[PDB]
TrEMBL record, chains A, B:
UniProt-listed CDD domains: HDAC_classII_APAH (cd10001)
Binding site for Mg(2+) 1: 107, 109
Co-factor requirement: Zn(2+)
GO biological process: epigenetic regulation of gene expression
Residues at which Mg(2+) 3 binds: 291, 327, 329
Listed PANTHER family: HISTONE DEACETYLASE 8, HISTONE DEACETYLASE HDAC1-RELATED
Occurrences of domain Histone deacetylase (ranges): 31-339
Family: Belongs to the histone deacetylase family.
Keywords: Hydrolase, Metal-binding, Zinc
Residues that coordinate or bind Mg(2+) 2: 291
Protein name: Acetoin utilization deacetylase AcuC
Species of provenance: Marinobacter subterrani
Pfam families on file: Hist_deacetyl
Length: 346, 346
């Protein structure tokens, strides 16, 4: 079995929120630290390859994707929330509704809503540090691949694919896959494809490159008429201006199994083949799993071996960034199965 | 000692939600049924005038302001929420963030967020019926004034001035003041002015009439840089198209007393004079009170007598619709002081 290096930051545990708005209640959050620990434990148990801590790259590569005002806001948000007297975790209460101005207010609640697309992504102490570390995990994995490695697994937490240039939500703060893709471009890779196999639409990634043709964005995901993010991810979203035909959404209905889902994967793979990129970033969620608690696809653990194998056949230098996946007792087997299938395990 | 009739619906108590999102916690809601009961008890106690229940006007006059799809959503929201397995009250978890499509999704969570500007306005059983009655309360007070009375007090609960044609929030669902103003227009009153003295900007009222010169909208409110609604209410918002110069926002900072606020009141009365309307709707909030728990002005109970005095001097047929005010100890004295001052109390 071939080897793959994994990049992991123990600082992920700095993000350990206690509350998630879900169905009118404050529930125990899905995107929990045990996700990353269960994966890493499987990486060591399977001897997948070397495990590295990330390098500190600073905010430069982050700000090639995200606005300076947004990066500023994430650094100060918690301290301003506590200094303003709020007693819970930092959660938006109101936002720019349809018909209101996209105008940045002074107030911390106002800015919370300005910079978000959802209320289920609580911020608290350590969120800044952990989101910073997750971006560096992606960037170190990009560095590994750019310096000779065929592939590298960025064991990111928190995930990234829902974050726009200046919008957080869906458990994501910095868009690690977009940051990795932009890092390839800044280093002289002319074309980069970002393939999102997470159950949910990679709406942040779509928006970040939506008017560009140097970065092909493809997502397979549940129908947004039915699931989050609801307001992007439809198949008619093919790109704007110069980006026209450089975005591809493939949507599936509830109960979709691998025998169907992989037909979309094949169409994604053909789209990538004709684009002929110099690098590949795979935003990898395993919330396509048949027992995933918030998702409605029917992939089995063994199907992730087949997903890994199909991605290797693209023949591309490949960065995997960890996104979703919330059935914790299976998440290690599922995620590492993709890496192991990539390395030739069947 | 002149008299003024009050329209009151016992159906308001059908809205009695248990939770409000606030500072990251689900707290006891501020817009509570005892607001309406405390005002009503003070109406009786001061013998202000005859009290009557509203008439049923149907959805016709409501849809002169609100879109049919929005009205349908409010009727079915709670049934769909419960049938979908949610255990809390109906609260939006995600919305159309900046960079997403204003596209109506099939999913109820999606639609909740599409139709809202905030998450502090829970929907539960009875909300539909209470919102219907509140609008009938305002339409009944409008009927009393159009049939020959100088003024009438619509004891509306829930309030309305934050609701757009198809957005709810700020504790509001149907814009009662806008509905009354439109009823005035539909009955041959050439021009109508809506004056918002609630602590918060009447963003929904502004939006509904923003491109019109036949309905003048004025609001006095706390700086939206600092307080809700945050994304409308700035003084540079003066109307668009045919509505240009027919919207007026007057903002004040924290700690503003009546001596300063009444200077803004005078600028508003002068704007009303030069508009020369055939009718006046006053969106009356007494969250301008020095003891209001969520607001930062410093009006005294006696100041409301003076505000009612000043409004009567405008010499107009006048409908008062009840908006906000959350110090329940003083809410009856404050709101009824406005009507009594209108009738000549000092
Ligand atoms: N409490 C709200 C739950 C909604 C699901 C958010 C989607 C997160 C995700 O898994 N993105 O890949
Ligand atoms: N919990 C504070 C949420 C901000 C909304 C204020 C709406 C209250 C009001 O009275 N508007 O007139
Ligand atoms: K996806
Ligand atoms: K693109
Ligand atoms: K106001
Ligand atoms: K207007
Ligand atoms: Mg605030
Ligand atoms: Mg399981
Ligand atoms: Mg849903
Ligand atoms: Zn996902
Ligand atoms: Zn108010």
């Amino acid at each position: 079995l071939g080897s793959m290096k994994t990049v992991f930051s123990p600082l992920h545990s700095r993000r350990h929120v206690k509350t998630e708005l879900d169905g009118g209640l404050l529930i125990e959050p899905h995107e929990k630290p045990s996700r990353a620990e269960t994966i890493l434990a499987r990486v060591k148990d399977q001897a997948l390859g070397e495990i590295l801590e990330p390098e500190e790259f600073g905010l430069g590569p982050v700000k090639r994707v995200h606005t300076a005002d947004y990066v500023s806001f994430l650094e100060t948000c918690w301290d301003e929330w506590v200094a303003a007297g709020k007693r819970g975790e930092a959660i938006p209460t109101f936002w720019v509704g349809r018909g209101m101005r996209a105008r940045l207010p002074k107030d911390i609640d106002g800015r919370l809503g300005y910079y978000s697309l959802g209320a289920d992504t609580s911020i608290s102490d350590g969120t800044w540090e952990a989101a910073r570390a997750s971006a560096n995990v992606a960037l170190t994995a990009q560095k590994l691949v750019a310096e000779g490695e065929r592939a590298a697994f960025a064991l990111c937490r928190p995930p990234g694919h829902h974050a726009h240039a200046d919008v957080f939500g869906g458990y994501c703060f910095f868009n690690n896959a977009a940051i990795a893709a932009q890092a390839f471009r800044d280093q002289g890779y002319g074309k980069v494809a970002v393939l999102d196999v997470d159950f949910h639409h990679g709406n942040g990634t779509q928006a970040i490159f939506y008017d560009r043709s140097d970065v092909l964005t493809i997502s397979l995901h549940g129908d947004p008429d039915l699931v989050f993010p609801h307001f992007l991810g439809f198949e008619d979203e093919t790109g704007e201006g110069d980006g026209e035909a450089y975005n591809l959404n493939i949507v599936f209905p509830p109960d979709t199994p691998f025998s169907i889902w992989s037909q979309g994967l094949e169409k994604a793979c053909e789209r990538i083949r004709t684009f002929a990129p110099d690098a590949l970033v795979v935003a990898l969620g395993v919330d396509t799993f048949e027992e995933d608690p918030i998702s409605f696809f029917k992939l089995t653990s063994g199907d992730y071996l087949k997903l890994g194998k199909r991605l290797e056949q693209l023949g591309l230098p490949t960065v995997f960034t960890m996104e979703g996946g919330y059935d914790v007792d299976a998440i290690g087997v599922n995620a590492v199965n993709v890496m192991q299938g990539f390395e030739g395990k069947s």
